[PDB]
């Protein structure tokens, strides 16, 4: 209920490429073996990562990056998606750090942490096997402390404040994903003018249509993760005008066809 997990198979020397990928919830991912090369197109940095490198992706960010396998065997990429309800339960564990965190910047959307033995073991277990599950207290302490040391390393906010304008925009769109959203609706619903709100899109490198489409793709991904497989139904449930429009945007965003992503999940 707190963590949704996926393990993707990555073939030798394959490359996954994401363009305008909207991060609907906080995510963490890492490879289980070998080496990979992560290229972050938004900041123009590359990382060689190994099985202890954790990549954290901030909620409401718009990602542009590739991941290239450098191993001659299959690599498994584990992905934890953290529920909003679990994040909210961390509020008391970092509130005391308000003075500390108000000094941090808010720009970085993709963060790396090189793990010690104990930390990668816990994260693997979340994705896996224990007869007695970690307690709620253990998990809240582990993840608040983990995010805290990542934030300190970068002097940067990872867990964004509840009042952020991008969260207001995204939450509104996600409340009625098929609505024929236009900028005026956002300004009207948030009672905030365009001069203020537009920086949320500008700083993320998207125009309005690209933003709405990106949120709709991540909705379709969520539907597929629940076991929906009827491509036409998925396209319409997610607010696309047609299957062809859905497929075109999905291909641009994920660099694979919807049918191929379904196979990565269920095949
Ligand atoms: C077409 C690629 C399929 C997904 C492979 C994911 C591998 C590395 C990136 C992990 C973070 C982005 C995951 C997006 C899909 C998801 O939400 O599970
Ligand atoms: Cl629309
Ligand atoms: Cl009003
Ligand atoms: Cl715009």
Numbering used by the authors: 5 to 132, 134 to 272
Quote from the publication.
ToxT is an AraC-family transcriptional activator of Vibrio cholerae virulence-gene expression, with a C-terminal DNA-binding domain and an N-terminal domain involved in dimerization and effector binding. ToxT directly activates the expression of the genes encoding the toxin-coregulated pilus (TCP), which is essential for colonization of the human intestine, and the cholera toxin (CT), the cause of the diarrheal disease that is characteristic of cholera. In V. cholerae, ToxT-dependent gene activation is inhibited by both bile and individual unsaturated fatty acids found in bile. Although oleic acid is likely to be the physiological effector of ToxT given its high concentration in bile, both PAM and oleic acid have been shown to reduce the expression of tcp and ctx in vivo and to reduce DNA binding by ToxT in vitro.
However, the structure determined by Lowden et al. contains a disordered region between residues Asp101 and Glu110 within the N-terminal domain. Interestingly, Asp101–Glu110 could be modeled in this structure, which included helix α1 and a loop region that connects this helix to the β9 sheet. In this region, helix α1 spans Ser87–Ile98 and contains a kink at Leu94. This is followed by a 310-helix spanning Leu99–Asp101 that continues into a shorter helix from Leu102 to Leu107 (α1′). Tyr108–Asp113 form a connecting loop between α1′ and β9. This region appears to be stabilized by residue Glu156, in helix α3, through a salt bridge with residue Arg105. Interestingly, the ToxT region between α1 and β9 (residues Asp101–Glu110) is folded over a loop that is located sequentially after it: the loop that connects helices α3 and α4, spanning residues Lys158–Ala170. Our structure suggests the possibility that Arg105 holds Glu156 in a position that somewhat attenuates ToxT activity. In addition, three chloride ions were modeled in the C-terminal region of ToxT, which were assigned based on the coordination distances (∼3.1–3.3 Å) to neighboring residues and water molecules. Overall, the new structure provides more complete, detailed and higher quality structural information for ToxT than the previously determined ToxT structure.
